[PDB]
Structure 1
Amino acid sequence: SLAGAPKYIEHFSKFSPSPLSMKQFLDFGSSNACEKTSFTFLRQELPVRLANIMKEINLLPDRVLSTPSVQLVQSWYVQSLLDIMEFLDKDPEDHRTLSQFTDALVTIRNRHNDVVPTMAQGVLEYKDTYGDDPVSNQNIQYFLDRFYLSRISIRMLINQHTLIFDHIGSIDPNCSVSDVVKDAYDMAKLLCDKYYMASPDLEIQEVNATNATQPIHMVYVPSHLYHMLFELFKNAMRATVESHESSLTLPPIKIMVALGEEDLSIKMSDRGGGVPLRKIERLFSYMYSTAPGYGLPISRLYAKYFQGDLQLFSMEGFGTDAVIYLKALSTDSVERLPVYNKSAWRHYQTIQEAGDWCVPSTEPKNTSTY
């Protein structure tokens, strides 16, 4: 019942989401063509993940929560929860049940397809209506990382089931990192040379410390890797073109792929003139990037999703290095999932607080003599 929604939220938000490893995905999708086991996992797990995050959507500032776009998103989540909860009483041993469940997941995925730009629209509707509030901004920042990571994880779950039951799903067991780098480059180059009429070359190098001569492969979701690389390539290309005057001497974008025992690291280096350090932190800020640009903070979420990271280090006047850190081993590649609990609830009860450190005066005392 639509009326009972707030109690279904209470029931399922009380549970903790179940983070899966890429090993588990791989062991399941290659051994278990078992639709029943996936159905019975997902008919519980998807409501758990939905209810956990919806519990946090409802902890948003009233001014954000009440925007048309955030209300539209919330209604999507309500309906998707209701769609899946219809399968709770259903017999896993009936194939009509299973075929209808896959159809319901396709519908949910189509419905939620524009969640990212719609949520960003809502934040923009808040920005261009309710001036500036720091505490609200920090709660929004806190929420958005979790919401978007939750969303990445739900889509992953839906993608695994649908690709397997109507690559191991979206997972490539033998993903050629260099090939994904080239694909991302080729696409960004295309957009660059058709929006500037000039583009930098690519230089790739590999250092495989585990096996000196072997091309670097990993178990990964290629589209996630591509997403990250594509966003970073575009930035490096834009920066390179905008900071240079000649068509003929554009510095190349340099890629280093390194594989160690624990990490697979991909560094992208540009000579695009760099950016001041004080500005690096706002590049992952959702509030700063909403004009009057969610590529970077979301790319970092893709890296964090399986316990990796994405870090930037520029040198103002020279250029910037961007590093994607990934886990080399599939047992280490575990889902990074937000969980609603009292600990999460406290993060929304943040107050306006005095500084931890001294703030210098805007007009410091003149110390020169007479």
Structure 2
Amino acid sequence: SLAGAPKYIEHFSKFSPSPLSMKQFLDFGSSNACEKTSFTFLRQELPVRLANIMKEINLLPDRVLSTPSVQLVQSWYVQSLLDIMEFLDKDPEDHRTLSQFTDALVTIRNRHNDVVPTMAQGVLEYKDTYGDDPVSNQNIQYFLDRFYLSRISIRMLINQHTLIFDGSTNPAHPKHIGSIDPNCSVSDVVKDAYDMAKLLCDKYYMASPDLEIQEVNATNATQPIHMVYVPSHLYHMLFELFKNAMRATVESHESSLTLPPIKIMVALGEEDLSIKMSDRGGGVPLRKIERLFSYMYSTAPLAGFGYGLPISRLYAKYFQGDLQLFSMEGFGTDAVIYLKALSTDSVERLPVYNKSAWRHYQTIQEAGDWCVPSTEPKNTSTY
């Protein structure tokens, strides 16, 4: 019941979300992936993940909350909570209850399909009024990484259930366990992502850098590098990075014609799988690197919006990896996706509401930790 929504939130937000390993996902979709145990798990966990993050939605400045776009996703989360909550006391071992559960998840996924651009519009709507505010910046930034990561994990869980149980029969990948490829060809995903970005590049500039691909398997000298991953997550990251590198290469070669290739390095160690994308696209000054992962910086008032970088990083952070950038202004840039090599180490990174999360919101403006130089420095030159 909609009236009781705030107490459902208070109930489930008290609980801690349950992070899963890729080993756990994979081992579950074994042979007799037990729909009963997937339903009963999700019936509980999804509300836990929803309530936790909604608790944090309610903690952002009222100037952001008031915007139509924010509230539009707030309304989506409230409904999703309820649609799922109408299953809590339903009976497993009944195919009706299970079948209409996956239907409900399909609807939730269709409902939440535009969450990314819509939350981005709310920040834009915030930017088209109060503008900038240091303390407000921090809170929105802290919130967005968490919100978006919470989202990816919710998508994950939903897709796993739907792809396995009979929201498929023909259209999927009859080798994947859900969205998970146990023998994912890292190189093929690199080539796929390159193909699309190149295509978009040629159809927006008429010029394009080539691809150079190299591999170093330090675990087995000769072996092509494969891993247990979600190829679409991987695809998203590389597709995005590729586009950034392609724009940069073409735009910084105003005198050119003779485009320096984008070089890819795939390394595998005992613990890491590293993918380095190198470009000779003129680089970015160091003080601007940090800005590039800011949501409030890359938005106004191949290159679409300005959320490709922060979001790709979240994809990489989701299974305990990272995406780091290091340019050299005047030469080019290196972007690096870091992934856990082992499916045991590939554990969900999930935001958690608690006193610790609460205090990251509503924080004060502090005095500088280090010296701040004067704008007009004292001229110490002689007579």
**TM bin (shorter chain):** over 0.9
Q: 1:210 Cα shift?
A: 0.3
- For the 8 Å contact 1:198–1:247, the answer to whether it is kept is no
Q: 2:373 aligns with which of 353, 356, 360?
A: 360
> CA 1:295 to 1:99, structure 2 compared with 1: closer, same or farther past 3 Å?
same
Q: 1:32 Cα shift?
A: 3.7
Q: 1:76 Cα shift?
A: 0.2
Distance 2:93 2:244 in 1: 50
Q: 1:280 Cα shift?
A: 0.3
> CA 1:345 to 1:203, structure 2 compared with 1: closer, same or farther past 3 Å?
same
- For the 8 Å contact 1:207–1:257, the answer to whether it is kept is yes
Distance 2:145 2:299 in 1: 15
Q: 1:129 Cα shift?
A: 1.0
| Range 174-183 or range 243-252, more displaced | 243-252
Q: Which residue of 2 aligns with 1:65?
A: 65
Distance 2:265 2:357 in 1: 38
How many corresponding residue pairs?
Answer: 370
| Range 4-13 or range 349-358, more displaced | 349-358
- For the 8 Å contact 1:49–1:154, the answer to whether it is kept is yes
Distance 1:236 1:5 in 2: 46
| Range 232-241 or range 126-135, more displaced | 126-135
> Any idea what the Cα deviations from partners look like across 1:275-319, whole Å, max 9, x if unmatched?
100000000000001222100000000000000000000000000
- For the 8 Å contact 1:63–1:126, the answer to whether it is kept is yes
Gaps of 5+ in 1: none
Task: Report the RMSD for the aligned CA atoms in angstroms.
Answer: 0.7
Q: 1:247 Cα shift?
A: 5.7
- Give TM-score scaled by structure 1 length: 0.99
> Any idea what the Cα deviations from partners look like across 1:337-358, whole Å, max 9, x if unmatched?
0000000000002101111010
Q: 2:218 aligns with which of 204, 209, 212?
A: 209
Q: Extract structure 1 runs of 4+ deviating beyond 3 A.
A: 245-248
Distance 1:171 1:21 in 2: 12
> Any idea what the Cα deviations from partners look like across 1:108-139, whole Å, max 9, x if unmatched?
00000000000000000000111221100100
Alignment of 1:287-366 (within 5 A): 287-292=296-301, 293-366=306-379
| Range 29-38 or range 89-98, more displaced | 29-38
> Any idea what the Cα deviations from partners look like across 1:27-72, whole Å, max 9, x if unmatched?
0012442110000000000000000000000001000011000000
> Any idea what the Cα deviations from partners look like across 1:144-197, whole Å, max 9, x if unmatched?
000000000000000000000020000000000000000000000000001000
| Range 111-120 or range 285-294, more displaced | 285-294
Q: Which residue of 2 aligns with 1:282?
A: 291
- For the 8 Å contact 1:207–1:259, the answer to whether it is kept is yes
| Range 357-366 or range 28-37, more displaced | 28-37
Distance 1:90 1:333 in 2: 33
Distance 1:345 1:218 in 2: 37
Q: 1:246 Cα shift?
A: 5.3
| Range 29-38 or range 133-142, more displaced | 29-38
Q: 1:79 Cα shift?
A: 0.1
Q: 1:363 Cα shift?
A: 0.2
Q: 1:248 Cα shift?
A: 3.9
| Range 217-226 or range 346-355, more displaced | 346-355
Q: 1:245 Cα shift?
A: 3.2
Distance 1:98 1:288 in 2: 45
Distance 2:377 2:147 in 1: 43
Distance 1:128 1:311 in 2: 30
Distance 1:32 1:147 in 2: 33
Secondary structure of 2:107 counterpart: helix
- For the 8 Å contact 1:274–1:319, the answer to whether it is kept is yes
Distance 1:222 1:59 in 2: 34
- Give TM-score scaled by structure 2 length: 0.96
Distance 1:333 1:246 in 2: 45
> CA 1:339 to 1:32, structure 2 compared with 1: closer, same or farther past 3 Å?
farther
| Range 283-292 or range 331-340, more displaced | 283-292
